[PDB]
Every structure is written in C-alpha cells, then in structure tokens.
Design a protein around this ligand. Structure first.
Ligand SMILES: C=CCNc1nc(N)c(C(=O)c2ccc(Cl)s2)s1
Length: 294
C-alpha cells in the first residue's frame, strides 16, 4: 500500500498479516489487514463492503475496504491492546471481577447488535477482542468468515486456534447459527476468570474430547440430533459431566449459571446475547478503567 505508511507489523491475522499504518492524507493511525489468490471473489468484496455500515461502540469499525492493484485490504480503527495480551499481562493478579463483568457485558452487547443485523462472527478469540484505556472492549472481524471461508491454515503456515470452537462445528455441521458466538464468548469468559484457557485442544479431536471430559459426552437426551451430526462417532468415549463448580472457581453462582447457559451443547438451548444481557449476573455491572501498559 502507498496511501499508507506501515509503522509496524502488528501481528498475524486469520486471513493475513496485520499492520499498524498511517493514512497519508489524514494522518490517522489504523489497523490495516492484507487479505491473502486468483482474483478475489466479487461476492466477498460486496459482502464485506456491507460491513462498513455496522456501527456500535463495541464493534471495531471497518473504516474501508480497499481493492486496488488486484489486492484486498481492510482498514479498521486502531485499538491499543488485545485481550490476549491484557490477560497475559494480568496473569499474576488476574483481571478484577468488576472489569471481567464489564467486558463480558459489552461483548454481549456487540454480539446482540451483530446478531440482530444477521451477522455472525464465527471465530471469536482473545486476539480479536480489542480494548482501550477508557474501559471499552470491541469485537473485530465480525462477518468475515461468512464472506470469505475459514481456511485450514494461513499462508504463513501458522497454527489456527481451536480453543473457542463450538462443538457443532467440531462435529462437522456446515450450518452456523448465532449460538457459535455465544459458545466462544463463554470460553473467553471462563478464561478471564480462571486465567487459563478452558478447552486448550491441540487438534480437532483433542478439542472435542476436552469439551466432553468437562461437560460430559453429549447424547440424544441433552442434544437431540447429535448422533446424526456429520463427524459424530458412536465410538466416542463416554465421559461423565463434571461438577460445574470445579470448572470456574471461584466465580459466584450467578456467573456460573450464566456460563452454563452459554455452554449448553444444543445450539438451540444456548442463551442468546440479548437474553444474557438480562441475566442477574449483570445487575451490579459497572464500567471500570483497566490498567493498560502500552
Ligand atoms: C498493539 C495494538 C494493535 N491494535 C489493533 N487494532 C486492531 N483493530 C486490531 C485487529 O483488528 C486485529 C489484529 C489481529 C486480529 Cl485476529 S484482529 S489489532
């Protein structure tokens, strides 16, 4: 890109490298993402372009879609730190509960907004949750997966994380629903509380079995239709569900209750973002400022 000035290489995005850049005509700093190649689907540019229309305090604004020199670029508002880094920085003391609650509440608002606009994320993870000094947290990359197509591996041959993947996706369901995002957010909520990833699988089957070992191997009783999912196998080991109090100590009953509703196996039974916002866990929610080291 010329219309920009690459300050640094922020990191590795799901679809390509992410750069911290400066708009040459405005002097503004943004998050520039180069999308990894046979012409660029015209369907994608149209889909993605509609996203520039989404506007919410908890959604990282897609400023522009730039298609020039037969290369694709997405220009996003720049935020100063991601939740992965903040969690790592908060590892010794943990994120204070009131801030964890504020972040969860805000993320649910961003989800509620996108879902009401018929937009799913499908690949929520600590790396695409961005925070600022003011106490806000925003979701980036909403609607990209559907417009594009989650590739097995990036062109950088970097490992894609499966830790936040809903069980229905792992079982090979090719139809997504808003519930996949609630699942990912539930996993993130648990990780903020315990300071350890909930289901750190290193493979698709390891990821599935780690979920099974904690929540019990699903059956037709708790998840009608599961034995007919594409990758379900009658040979899956049968693990008993573990007492949920052992899962996220020392989160209180309201928090554990909300989390269990975000982690129901049946997508249809999983709580909606809108309903979650009404949960008693948020009765005393506030908006604390985080201690960010930039
Ligand atoms: C050190 C400050 C970095 N600032 C950033 N700002 C934005 N907007 C970022 C992203 O959208 C993503 C980057 C990677 C994924 Cl995955 S989403 S990173």
């Amino acid at each position: 890109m010329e219309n920009f000035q690459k300050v640094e290489k922020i990191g590795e995005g799901t679809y390509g490298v992410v750069y911290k850049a400066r708009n040459k005509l405005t002097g503004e700093v943004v998050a520039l993402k180069k999308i990894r190649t046979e012409g660029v689907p015209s369907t994608a540019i149209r889909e993605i372009s509609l996203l520039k229309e989404l506007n919410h305090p908890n959604i990282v604004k897609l400023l522009d879609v730039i298609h020039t020199e037969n290369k694709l670029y997405l220009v996003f508002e720049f935020l100063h730190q991601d939740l992965k880094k903040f969690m790592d920085a908060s590892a010794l003391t943990g994120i204070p509960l009131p801030l964890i609650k504020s972040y969860l509440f805000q993320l649910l608002q961003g989800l509620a907004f996108c879902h009401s606009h018929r937009v799913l994320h499908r690949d929520l993870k600590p790396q695409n949750l961005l925070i600022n000094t003011e106490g806000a947290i925003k979701l980036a990359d909403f609607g990209l997966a559907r417009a594009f197509g989650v590739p097995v591996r990036t062109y950088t041959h970097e490992v894609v994380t499966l830790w936040y993947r809903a069980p229905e996706i792992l079982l090979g369901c090719k139809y997504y629903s808003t519930a996949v995002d609630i699942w990912s957010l539930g996993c993130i909520f648990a990780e903020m509380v315990t300071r350890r990833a909930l289901f750190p699988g290193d493979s698709e089957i390891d990821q599935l079995f780690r979920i099974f070992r904690t929540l019990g191997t699903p059956d037709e009783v708790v998840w009608p239709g599961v034995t007919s999912m594409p990758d379900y196998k009658p040979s899956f080991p049968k693990w008993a569900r573990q007492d949920f109090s052992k899962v996220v100590p020392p989160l209180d009953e309201d928090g554990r209750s909300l989390l269990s509703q975000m982690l129901h196996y049946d997508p249809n039974k999983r709580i909606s973002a809108k309903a979650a916002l009404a949960h008693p866990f948020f009765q005393d929610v506030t908006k604390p400022v985080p201690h960010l080291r930039l």
